[PDB]
Design a protein around this nucleic acid. Structure first.
Ligand SMILES: N[C@@H](Cc1c[nH]c2ccccc12)C(=O)O
Ligand SMILES: [Mg+2]
Ligand SMILES: [Mg+2]
Ligand SMILES: [Mg+2]
Ligand SMILES: [Mg+2]
Ligand SMILES: [Mg+2]
Ligand SMILES: [Mg+2]
Ligand SMILES: [Mg+2]
Ligand SMILES: [Mg+2]
Ligand SMILES: [Mg+2]
Ligand SMILES: [Mg+2]
Ligand SMILES: [Mg+2]
Ligand SMILES: [Mg+2]
Ligand SMILES: [Mg+2]
Ligand SMILES: [Mg+2]
Ligand SMILES: [Mg+2]
Ligand SMILES: [Mg+2]
Ligand SMILES: [Mg+2]
Ligand SMILES: [Mg+2]
Ligand SMILES: [Mg+2]
Ligand SMILES: [Mg+2]
Ligand SMILES: [Mg+2]
Ligand SMILES: [Mg+2]
Ligand SMILES: [Mg+2]
Ligand SMILES: [Mg+2]
Ligand SMILES: [Mg+2]
Ligand SMILES: [Mg+2]
Ligand SMILES: [Mg+2]
Ligand SMILES: [Mg+2]
Ligand SMILES: [Mg+2]
Ligand SMILES: [Mg+2]
Ligand SMILES: [Mg+2]
Ligand SMILES: [Mg+2]
Ligand SMILES: [Mg+2]
Ligand SMILES: [Mg+2]
Ligand SMILES: [Mg+2]
Ligand SMILES: [Mg+2]
Ligand SMILES: [Mg+2]
Ligand SMILES: [Mg+2]
Ligand SMILES: [Mg+2]
Ligand SMILES: [Mg+2]
Ligand SMILES: [Mg+2]
Ligand SMILES: [Mg+2]
Ligand SMILES: [Mg+2]
Ligand SMILES: [Mg+2]
Ligand SMILES: [Mg+2]
Lengths: 41, 46, 16, 77
RNA sequence: UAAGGUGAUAUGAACCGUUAUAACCGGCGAUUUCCGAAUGGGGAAACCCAGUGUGUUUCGACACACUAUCAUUAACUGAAUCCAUAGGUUAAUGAGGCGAACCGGGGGAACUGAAACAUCUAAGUACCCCGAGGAAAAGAAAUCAACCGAGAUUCCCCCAGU
RNA sequence: GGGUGACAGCCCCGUACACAAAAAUGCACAUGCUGUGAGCUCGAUGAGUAGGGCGGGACACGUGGUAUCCUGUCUGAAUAU
RNA sequence: UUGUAUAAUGGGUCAGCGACUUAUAUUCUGUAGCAAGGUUAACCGAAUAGGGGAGCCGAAGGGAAACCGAGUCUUAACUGGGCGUUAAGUUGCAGGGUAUAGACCCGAAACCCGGUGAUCUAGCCAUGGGCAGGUUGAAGGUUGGGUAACACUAACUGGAGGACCGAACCGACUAAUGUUGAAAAAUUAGCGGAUGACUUGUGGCUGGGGGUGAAAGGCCAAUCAAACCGGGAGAUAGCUGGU
RNA sequence: GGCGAGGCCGAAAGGCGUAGUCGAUGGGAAACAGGUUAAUAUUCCUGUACUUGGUGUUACUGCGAAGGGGGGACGGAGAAG
RNA sequence: CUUGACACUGAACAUAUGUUCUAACGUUGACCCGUAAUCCGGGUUGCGGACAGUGUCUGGUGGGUAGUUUGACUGGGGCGG
């Protein structure tokens, strides 16, 4: 799943950056805790 | 000898009465069948 | 219904 | 009932066909799971009984859109 | 519309009416006890027990009206929690139940036939359930055709027992 | 067609035919109000979808060399060039 | 039925009812029309008229088929051989047979589907009642003897027990009667339990491949190796009876 | 034990179940003797009583629950007064 | 009933395995609220934790259950042939 980071999580990428993450990792952690928005555009 | 019909009005009405027929969904079907036949007496109450 | 000597077994099964 | 709230998937019937083709009735059940989705518009967690196909639909379309669709169809959540 | 009439077994008594309020027939209204979806609570149907608000009393009491549940909408109120939500109260609108068959859909047999039986048939039949209507359903080509063309859906006769 | 003391065109009720509505209502018109919008130009062309793997079902078609339709599960495009 | 006076079946008798039908398709016969042709179906028509020739059957066959065609196939090809040319059809009406439907009529035991049943009986749950009368005498206790203290023992007391005898009540071991009974399970005379794993009244719960069962396939409304009622249903019947 | 607003569950029908609400076979106030009718009586009559609740005067006064406590409220057998 | 694959299902580290974490998920743990409530729902916390559980596919087992089969001749049938 392609997601755009809105913060710096040092594990995988920098702020404002598109990257491939697993769907559950995006669905359960990032999007409910900020830090990422899906690449809806 | 003790025969199979030992009558009781209370048990008769709780078993076959009109309110028990309306309480179960298939009892309402029973009343529909008896009304469509045209019975003088639907249930055991009268 | 039926007669008891026809329901009985010792006299009905008289010639097995 | 085992009905998906998003995609409406419900159990369907089929057959068990063996090696000798003996057909006996069986049901296909959806892959239903009760999941708490974080809705941002309400700052809330909404629990939905949704299949995994429904979860994929959620992730594609956005939780707000399908919540609007559910409210239009009238079922509570 | 009328010289007769008060339904029948069913006579009789008391009467009404004869030129138009007798009776009879039709349209519109009025009353419509109690049970029954039954709907104020309950119930062993045709019964028991109320709450609230008006009004009347001879101070003993009495009459009427409202009070079910669910769905939608709106108002007021409102938790854990600070806003909010969940919830509660009210008001308005709608539904419920019954009915022969036909119709759409969700489930769905077996005896039987195969000269036994298991794939197959019976048969998506019987039956159960849901929903709607005066009909329903389907319907305006991501359809067929064959190098020529036809032009939504439905129904009958052929194609073809091919 | 029925009745009348036995079988009635001319005894009675009727039938062909010609009429009749104070009141309510159905239908087809015509006409007001309310709600609704036509005409022309330009643009757009229904995505967890079509299709695919596995299991089933519907097509006269019993998986067969099996097209096509539906979907319980897992995936998944092109998008008027 | 090889064979019935048969002592093999059926029938007490009378009267009324009772069993080869109907629809569609196909072949054969008779008869009627037209004839290398015959005939329409749905539908239009107010129209048993008329229209409608969509189609169907026939006048051409051979071969698996392309294909050829009074011929064709086989084969590399037939002196050959197989099938054909060498005989008029079609549409009504009536009839025989067949096919699909219940298919000449009546008759199963059984299978499935949806319901009504625990007022009888099986078990459980709640809450009330019943058990005359008479015996036996456990533990424990008190006093006394006894012991270092127990232990042990005598008398008195006590009132145990799926204890004993025996009515109510519950049951059902034996015999006779009855067996178209007084009774679709009893009567009479004896018999077992009778303070318990007891018995009973009112009410509730468990449902049919299911319940319940101190277990007999027992009981579930005089029915149980799968209740009753309606439905599939006119199941099926190479079997019997009747016609 | 039944039904059961919301609710949890289930192809549909429906299954269970909380708040509630029903359900005696149980708990809850009070009447006895005499007489009478062809047929009723703890119901009628005679005599003598008892219970609960509403109203109104009198006197004193802290009353109030959907909440806390007590009570209702519980076995078998036996023995004697 | 059990085995595996895919899904719900995630993140670091070390050599598919192992260790560690919380955010999915479970809680028939504690407390608060709806609430007059041992159901249910929401909130905080704790304990597990990508395990368990469930869906589709799949191998094993499976008289727990169901549908049925179990030939004929025959000096009667079975046994023998
Ligand atoms: N004959 C006895 C017993 C009996 C009753 N039913 C029976 C049925 C079959 C045999 C015997 C019987 C009687 O009549 O009471
Ligand atoms: Mg009511
Ligand atoms: Mg009422
Ligand atoms: Mg009440
Ligand atoms: Mg309706
Ligand atoms: Mg069979
Ligand atoms: Mg057969
Ligand atoms: Mg047969
Ligand atoms: Mg329509
Ligand atoms: Mg063209
Ligand atoms: Mg005469
Ligand atoms: Mg398009
Ligand atoms: Mg597809
Ligand atoms: Mg394919
Ligand atoms: Mg002969
Ligand atoms: Mg002989
Ligand atoms: Mg002779
Ligand atoms: Mg003789
Ligand atoms: Mg004879
Ligand atoms: Mg015979
Ligand atoms: Mg005879
Ligand atoms: Mg030819
Ligand atoms: Mg069978
Ligand atoms: Mg009983
Ligand atoms: Mg004893
Ligand atoms: Mg006994
Ligand atoms: Mg005996
Ligand atoms: Mg005796
Ligand atoms: Mg004894
Ligand atoms: Mg004794
Ligand atoms: Mg035995
Ligand atoms: Mg019996
Ligand atoms: Mg059986
Ligand atoms: Mg049949
Ligand atoms: Mg029959
Ligand atoms: Mg209760
Ligand atoms: Mg409810
Ligand atoms: Mg319940
Ligand atoms: Mg009460
Ligand atoms: Mg009582
Ligand atoms: Mg008397
Ligand atoms: Mg438990
Ligand atoms: Mg078996
Ligand atoms: Mg058998
Ligand atoms: Mg044999
Ligand atoms: Mg022999």
């Amino acid at each position: 799943m392609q997601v755009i980071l809105l913060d710096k999580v040092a594990n995988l990428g920098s702020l404002g950056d598109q990257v491939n993450v697993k769907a559950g990792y995006a669905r359960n952690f990032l999007v409910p805790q900020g830090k990422a928005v899906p690449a809806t555009k | 000898m003790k025969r199979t019909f030992q009558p009781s009005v209370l048990k008769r009405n709780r078993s076959h009465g009109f309110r028990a027929r309306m309480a179960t969904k298939n009892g309402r079907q029973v009343l529909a069948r008896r009304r469509a036949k045209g019975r003088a007496r639907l249930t055991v109450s009268k | 219904t039926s007669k008891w000597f026809n329901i009985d077994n010792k006299i009905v099964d008289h010639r097995p | 009932s085992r009905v998906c709230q998003v995609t409406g998937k419900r159990p369907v019937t089929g057959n068990n066909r063996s090696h000798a083709l003996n057909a006996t009735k069986r049901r296909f059940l959806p892959n239903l799971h009760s999941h708490r989705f974080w809705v941002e518009s309400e700052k809330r967690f909404v629990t939905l009984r949704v299949s995994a196909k429904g979860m994929r639909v959620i992730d594609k379309k956005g939780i707000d859109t399908v919540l609007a669709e559910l409210r239009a169809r009238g079922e509570k959540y």
